[PDB]
Amino acid sequence: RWRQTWSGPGTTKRFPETVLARCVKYTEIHPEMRHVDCQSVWDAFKGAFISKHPCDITEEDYQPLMKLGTQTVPCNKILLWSRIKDLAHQFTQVQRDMFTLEDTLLGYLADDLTWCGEFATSKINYQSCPDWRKDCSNNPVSVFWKTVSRRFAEAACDVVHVMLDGSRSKIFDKDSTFGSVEVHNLQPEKVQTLEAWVIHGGREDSRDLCQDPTIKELESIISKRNIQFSCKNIYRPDKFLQCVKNPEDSSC
């Protein structure tokens, strides 16, 4: 209609079918999750937000889902990212040099989807869903991501990489999920170093963005956790990707 209860997009069309089909597909590829019952996954997922006011969702609502989707990826090969989705995923698709959150089952099930329910009825809302800004932050989508990204950062160890969008004006941004959750969930007992790869946009001959003020801030923030900091410009993202796929032939 012309009004809409909430200001964000409604649940993605086909959401139940999509999530079940992703679970089936993921548990076909990944032998360590080949024990998972996909219908039980869907039910645990749907139970977190059906018949619940979509501005009252808690991390508890998602605990049965997080249990069924329990998974360990190698803790020393984690790739976090911020505002540079495409290249982080492309990079991990190549030879599985690292794992992002969206290469875990739970991140895989939800990537790029929206969903909410209603306090009123047991139906899925396919017309609109709370916006984190205009409506409430404790909505099904934002809660889910906050919870699974905390857990994924908490699991990381050794050297943890992060890819940042060097086009952004705030290359490290305290308001992003990386700056507000993941970075404050790297464990000081386990993480030796965080290494940022700052991805350069197009043409420029370009500044050394590892000296950017927000990078120096990130550096001094993670030093209180007793984590070392390293930073690398990626000047040419498509030649980066090229070298990643053609390991050897080291023109570089």
Side-chain angles (χ1 to χ4, degrees), residues 1-94 96-202 206-235 237-245 247 252:
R1 330 192 262 60
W2 59 85
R3 243 227 65 236
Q4 286 328 350
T5 307
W6 302 120
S7 301
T11 295
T12 303
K13 289 288 269 42
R14 293 178 45 69
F15 175 76
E17 314 96 294
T18 299
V19 172
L20 192 65
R22 288 180 176 190
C23 189
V24 176
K25 180 170 198 247
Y26 189 100
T27 49
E28 286 169 335
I29 300 180
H30 290 95
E32 77 266 27
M33 305 295 284
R34 77 189 132 137
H35 67 281
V36 166
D37 175 274
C38 284
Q39 180 72 217
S40 293
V41 172
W42 166 236
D43 291 338
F45 202 145
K46 178 178 71 127
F49 69 92
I50 283 297
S51 308
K52 299 178 157 159
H53 190 282
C55 288
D56 192 37
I57 306 289
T58 57
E59 152 158 4
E60 285 94 341
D61 292 315
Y62 280 115
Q63 272 301 354
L65 176 65
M66 328 242 55
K67 283 205 194 352
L68 297 178
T70 295
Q71 174 163 201
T72 329
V73 307
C75 69
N76 65 312
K77 297 171 186 295
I78 286 186
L79 178 67
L80 298 183
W81 55 278
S82 198
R83 275 90 196 251
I84 191 87
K85 173 132 140 212
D86 239 282
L87 204 219
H89 292 329
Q90 278 182 83
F91 167 74
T92 57
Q93 298 278 112
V94 166
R96 337 242 84 179
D97 331 48
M98 300 168 196
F99 299 75
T100 56
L101 173 61
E102 300 79 20
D103 294 309
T104 73
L105 169 64
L106 284 167
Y108 185 97
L109 294 181
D111 195 15
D112 292 314
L113 299 187
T114 298
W115 64 84
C116 57
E118 346 188 326
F119 180 51
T121 191
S122 60
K123 265 184 292 205
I124 285 180
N125 195 338
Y126 299 91
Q127 270 311 111
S128 68
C129 281
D131 184 63
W132 152 288
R133 295 185 57 202
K134 316 108 193 265
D135 304 306
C136 49
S137 49
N138 302 332
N139 60 264
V141 174
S142 308
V143 167
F144 167 86
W145 287 116
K146 172 180 233 282
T147 305
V148 299
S149 81
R150 190 182 80 234
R151 287 169 100 270
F152 190 67
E154 282 170 345
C157 74
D158 301 337
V159 178
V160 175
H161 295 80
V162 56
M163 232 185 244
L164 312 168
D165 181 0
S167 298
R168 267 331 183 79
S169 99
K170 308 217 220 156
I171 302 172
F172 171 60
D173 182 348
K174 80 201 196 48
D175 288 337
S176 64
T177 290
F178 181 64
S180 72
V181 2
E182 294 177 337
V183 85
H184 287 111
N185 289 277
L186 298 172
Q187 302 297 287
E189 310 85 330
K190 278 119 70 67
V191 177
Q192 142 77 351
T193 296
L194 168 83
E195 166 163 299
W197 296 347
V198 177
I199 309 305
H200 280 61
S206 260
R207 298 146 49 223
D208 164 15
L209 294 167
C210 287
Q211 295 288 296
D212 186 84
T214 64
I215 297 300
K216 310 280 82 180
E217 182 218 284
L218 202 218
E219 182 174 43
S220 75
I221 285 190
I222 71 152
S223 308
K224 216 230 159 222
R225 283 192 171 258
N226 224 285
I227 299 172
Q228 285 172 208
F229 183 72
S230 155
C231 179
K232 237 181 82 198
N233 281 280
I234 302 185
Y235 279 110
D238 54 51
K239 147 160 110 143
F240 174 67
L241 256 200
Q242 197 49 208
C243 278
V244 169
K245 341 207 178 167
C252 297

